[PDB]
């Protein structure tokens, strides 16, 4: 990862990207900030409230 002009290893992102499980791309996990960040959906009760 480039840090203000100097590249340094990112060990968490390295592990995130390298965890592809034999697929072509990094795994998605719902409860983890992985290579795909983390996505929490709103509950369906958002439609009534708003």
């Amino acid at each position: 990862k480039n840090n203000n002009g100097l590249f340094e290893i990112d060990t968490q992102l390295s592990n995130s990207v390298a965890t592809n499980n034999g697929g072509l791309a990094p795994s998605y996990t719902e409860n983890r900030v992985d290579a795909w960040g983390k996505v929490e959906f709103a509950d369906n009760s958002v439609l009534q409230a708003r």
Binding site: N3, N4, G5, L6
Partner: protein, 48 residues
């Protein structure tokens, strides 16, 4: 014209004897690590 070149140094000033102003790499001042590590490349010769 190239850095680290000056083989002769005399002694250091009593007081400020120059004006000075400069432009800084604000990015590199943010990017540099907290701890500087020197080594044997900055030591004086162990014997003559």
């Amino acid at each position: 014209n190239t850095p680290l070149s000056a083989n002769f140094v005399n002694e250091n000033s009593y007081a400020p004897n120059s004006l000075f102003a400069a432009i800084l790499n604000e990015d590199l001042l943010t990017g540099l690590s907290d701890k500087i590590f020197y080594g044997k490349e900055n030591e004086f010769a162990e014997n003559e």
